[PDB]
Design a protein around this ligand. Structure first.
Ligand code: JWJ
Ligand code: MG
Ligand code: ZN
Length: 313
């Protein structure tokens, strides 16, 4: 109860910033997450024995893939922590509890392959879940881990609070299906511009939580340039392996996944920042003004990718 987690001074300071990198020491990531839960939620939100056993089961159910791994889970949870801390009064106690856990769990048991590859492969998960295939798997895995003896971190919530937090987590994890992001941001863009956006409207909150999840999930593009660039290597290592597996099924992959088109990466990154990243953090910065540093970081990184094309790096 009186047991805080405490980080070294550089981490204590930098963890509060949107662009914090969690570092290469895996054995500190659990404590970094607990630290974030304690400051974001309170030292009473979770029984420490049950939270620590939840964190270690979640870690075990992430695989050794180049990008969609345990480090990504903790990184995405840190971005969410930064959003919640800079927007203190806007979120309920249940939402703060649920969203950090949703981020930690959002890619549980990822295999390093897109929904599209599962469908073309004819993977069993694609028969069980026709859309948001991996994302429904991730939520399924989250529920399974919550139901292990000793792993129910939500046990001290009332019946209705428990149903509300699982519903927050489910929507939050489904929203990380990027195929749903485009329509979600268009709607939010319309509602903000016509003035109809209303954070007391549950269907509006859902949409805003949806965009926060996309923003945390894409946060690789909001780091300092050297983190952004080195993370892109891991992203393309998964994508190119998937492209290799498409070719094995006798399907030419899209250029994004074809390692034979490495050359076009800088131009592909431009389209991505223009089509997805910038619109995302722009609409988020309109709805949640204190998240502006993410939009500034993203634009800085667009400019770094522009310089790569121009041969300046
Ligand atoms: C953070 C991040 C960084 N990079 C990417 C890849 S996106 O930049 C991209 N789009 C294209 C289109 C054509 C193309 N030809 C050769 S590489 C390449 C591309 N890379 C994604 C998808 C990303 O987000 C995924 C995690 C969804
Ligand atoms: Mg995912
Ligand atoms: Zn993710």
């Amino acid at each position: 109860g009186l047991m805080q987690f405490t980080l070294p001074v550089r981490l204590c300071k930098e963890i509060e910033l949107f662009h914090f990198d969690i570092g290469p020491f895996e054995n500190m990531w659990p404590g970094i997450f607990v630290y974030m839960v304690h400051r974001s939620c309170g030292t009473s939100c979770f029984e420490l024995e049950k939270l620590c056993r939840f964190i270690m089961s979640v870690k075990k159910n992430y695989r050794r893939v180049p990008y969609h791994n345990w480090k990504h889970a903790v990184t995405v949870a840190h971005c969410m922590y930064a959003i919640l801390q800079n927007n203190h009064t806007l979120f309920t106690d249940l939402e703060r509890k649920g969203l950090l856990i949703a981020c930690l769990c959002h890619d549980l048991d990822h295999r390093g392959f897109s929904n599209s590859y599962l469908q073309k492969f004819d993977h069993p998960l694609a028969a069980l879940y026709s859309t948001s295939t991996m994302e429904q798997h991730h939520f399924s895995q989250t529920v399974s881990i919550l139901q292990l003896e000793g792993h129910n971190i939500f046990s001290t919530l009332s019946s209705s609070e428990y149903e509300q937090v699982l519903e927050i987590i489910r929507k939050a994890i489904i929203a990380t299906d990027l195929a749903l992001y485009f329509g979600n941001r268009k709607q939010l863009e319309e509602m903000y511009q016509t003035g109809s956006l209303n954070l007391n409207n549950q269907s509006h909150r859902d949409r805003v939580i949806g965009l926060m999840m996309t923003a945390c999930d894409l946060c690789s593009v909001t780091k300092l340039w050297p983190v952004t660039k080195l993370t892109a290597n891991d992203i393309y290592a998964e994508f190119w392996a998937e492209g290799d597996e498409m070719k094995k099924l006798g399907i030419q992959p899209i250029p994004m996944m074809d390692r034979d088109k490495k050359d076009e990466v800088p131009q592909g990154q431009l389209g991505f920042y223009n089509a997805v990243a910038i619109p995302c953090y722009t609409t988020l910065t309109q709805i949640l003004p204190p998240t502006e540093p993410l939009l500034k970081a993203c634009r800085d990184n667009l400019s770094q990718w522009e310089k790569v094309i121009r041969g300046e790096e």
